[PDB]
Design an enzyme around this catalytic site. Structure first.
Site, short mmCIF file in Angstrom:
data_model
loop_
_atom_site.label_atom_id
_atom_site.label_comp_id
_atom_site.label_asym_id
_atom_site.label_seq_id
_atom_site.Cartn_x
_atom_site.Cartn_y
_atom_site.Cartn_z
N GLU B 81 0.50 104.98 -1.41
CA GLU B 81 1.31 105.02 -0.23
C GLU B 81 0.71 106.03 0.77
O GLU B 81 1.41 106.48 1.66
CB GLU B 81 2.75 105.35 -0.59
CG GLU B 81 3.00 106.64 -1.35
CD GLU B 81 4.35 106.57 -2.08
OE1 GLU B 81 4.40 106.14 -3.28
OE2 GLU B 81 5.37 106.90 -1.45
N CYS B 113 6.12 104.37 -5.14
CA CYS B 113 5.56 104.81 -6.43
C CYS B 113 5.47 103.73 -7.50
O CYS B 113 4.99 104.00 -8.59
CB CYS B 113 6.36 105.97 -7.01
SG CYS B 113 6.50 107.29 -5.80
N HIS B 235 8.19 107.67 -14.30
CA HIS B 235 7.85 108.12 -13.00
C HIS B 235 8.66 109.40 -12.84
O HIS B 235 9.87 109.39 -13.07
CB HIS B 235 8.28 107.15 -11.92
CG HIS B 235 8.15 107.75 -10.57
ND1 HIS B 235 6.96 108.28 -10.11
CD2 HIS B 235 9.05 107.93 -9.58
CE1 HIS B 235 7.13 108.77 -8.90
NE2 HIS B 235 8.39 108.58 -8.55
#
Lengths: 78, 404
Positions: B81, B113, B235
């Site tokens: 990103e 993500c 994550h």
């Protein structure tokens, strides 16, 4: 099942997550953030209240409340 | 069929900031960052960008391949990103500087993500398709947080070589759950910037963590959230939030009591957080870093299954799994990630703030710039002679890199 009823459940878990507020006066105008409870614990309070009312909806539907009063309303409406 | 990660390599920056210094400089008590399980973040220099990060993460993989294996890499996916162009993928630069074949599909994947996981899954499907037996894919998740949010946002990249000989991580094929919907929890609507809501983002992560897993459970008969996974990697925007998610999952799926949840957290989740705490949130690469960390810090004296939860704001999510053997754990250990991370330059607060001020010269859209490698001489001392790629210049939007 009403605002003030829910707002009592919110105060309970708040004190239980943040014990130093046990004796502290809690207004509908109070923000969990300013009290000041971090994001992981704000979410934790929300999920404890949800489970208290066995309210099985997306957690994101309880976002956006700027104080515990507004959060009481939000809960009341579900 | 067999498929997964053949090789895994990490770049966690050349410099880092100890968050205790940031807390002190901002009058906060340390205990808040300790509370959230944040320790250090990796910090990108102005002569580094997501391309140089990606190349430095991938270089050790390529260095170990025979010429023949290197030419079998026929897809490079960059997952980010932190893109540098609206159309040109970073993969083109990466292919150039690693010397890969011209017979190679190259593109860049975006979904905050989740990008890394999406790239990995596309790579897995290339191999399973059997359209080109022997072809490998190189999947690199790379992100930098270029500020011109702050304490948690780091810089890093993790490169995955994906093939039909998965020495490191053998995928459980078809064992996938995913879940997504449009939500404005966090987005990046301007360059070198981020907008969103902490609370909404956390609540969405938790909703997805439950629903993606439920979809996996529906697909994989008889899985148990405690018994089927020896470790869990997530994550990790910061550790405290992963601890909260895991607590919520254990409470709901297993009705566990608080003490047992915490023991289960320390056993199955903490190993993956070790390297995360040393780099901060590296966006799409963070779950791959957690996998690497789980592998190096957990117990692999017998094969273990690892559950993986990926989330990306916006949003989309996926739960998936695979197996690591003792031999794969020994291969991963030869990478020396822990020693790499410990050798980084430790920034003072004065340096960190100068660094932020100087990062403006390489903002998105920069047409011409000539980098001064001696911005911080002591930082340079840590990079030079190690075989690292750096960003030397931008000339008419063309980025020029140099091995140093």
């Amino acid at each position: 099942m009403s605002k003030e009823q829910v707002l009592k459940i919110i105060k309970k878990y708040t004190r239980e997550i943040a014990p130093e507020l046990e004796d502290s006066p809690l207004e509908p105008t109070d923000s969990l953030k300013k009290l000041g409870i971090d994001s992981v614990n704000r979410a934790e309070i929300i999920m404890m209240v949800m489970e208290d009312l066995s309210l099985n909806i997306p957690r994101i539907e309880l976002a956006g409340a700027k104080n515990i009063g507004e959060l009481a309303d939000l809960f009341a409406a579900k | 069929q067999q498929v997964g990660i053949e090789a895994l390599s990490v770049y966690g920056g050349a410099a880092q900031l100890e968050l205790r210094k940031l807390a002190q400089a901002r009058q906060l008590d340390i205990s808040r960052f300790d509370n959230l399980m944040m320790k250090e973040k990796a910090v990108s220099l102005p002569y580094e960008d997501p391309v140089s990060y990606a190349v430095n993460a991938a270089k050790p993989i390529i260095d170990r391949l025979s010429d023949a294996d290197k030419q079998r890499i026929e897809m490079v996916i960059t997952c980010s990103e932190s893109g540098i162009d609206f159309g040109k993928s970073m993969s083109t630069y990466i292919q150039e500087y690693l010397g890969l074949s011209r017979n190679c599909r190259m593109f860049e994947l975006k979904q905050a993500c989740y990008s890394g996981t999406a790239g990995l899954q596309m790579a897995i499907n290339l191999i399973l398709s059997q359209t080109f037996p022997g072809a490998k894919a190189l999947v690199i998740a790379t992100d930098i947080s270029r500020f011109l949010a702050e304490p948690s946002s780091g810089a890093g990249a993790v490169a995955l070589l994906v093939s039909d000989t998965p020495h490191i991580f053998q995928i459980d094929v078809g064992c996938n759950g995913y879940y997504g919907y449009e939500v404005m929890d966090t987005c990046r609507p301007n360059p070198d910037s981020e907008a969103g809501d902490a609370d909404l983002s956390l609540l969405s992560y938790l909703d997805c963590c439950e629903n993606a897993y439920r979809h996996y459970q529906n697909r994989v008969e008889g899985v148990d959230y405690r018994e089927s996974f020896d470790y869990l990697s997530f994550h990790t925007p910061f550790g405290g939030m992963v601890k909260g998610a895991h607590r919520n999952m254990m409470r709901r799926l297993k009705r566990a009591k608080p003490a047992e949840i915490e023991a289960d957290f320390q056993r199955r989740v903490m190993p993956g957080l070790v390297y995360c705490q040393q780099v901060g949130n590296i966006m799409g690469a963070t779950l791959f870093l957690s996998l690497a960390s789980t592998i190096d810090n957990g117990d692999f004296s017998t094969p273990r299954r690892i559950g993986m939860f990926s989330y990306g704001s916006g949003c989309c999510s996926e739960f998936y799994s695979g197996v690591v053997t003792p031999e794969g754990a020994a291969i991963a250990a030869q990478q020396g990630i822990s020693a790499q991370l410990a050798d980084r330059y430790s920034l003072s607060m004065e340096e960190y703030e100068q660094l932020l001020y100087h990062s403006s010269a390489v903002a998105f859209g920069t047409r011409n710039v000539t980098l001064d490698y001696q911005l911080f001489p002591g930082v340079w001392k840590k990079i030079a002679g190690k075989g690292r790629l750096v960003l030397k210049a931008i000339k008419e939007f063309h980025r020029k890199y140099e091995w140093v």
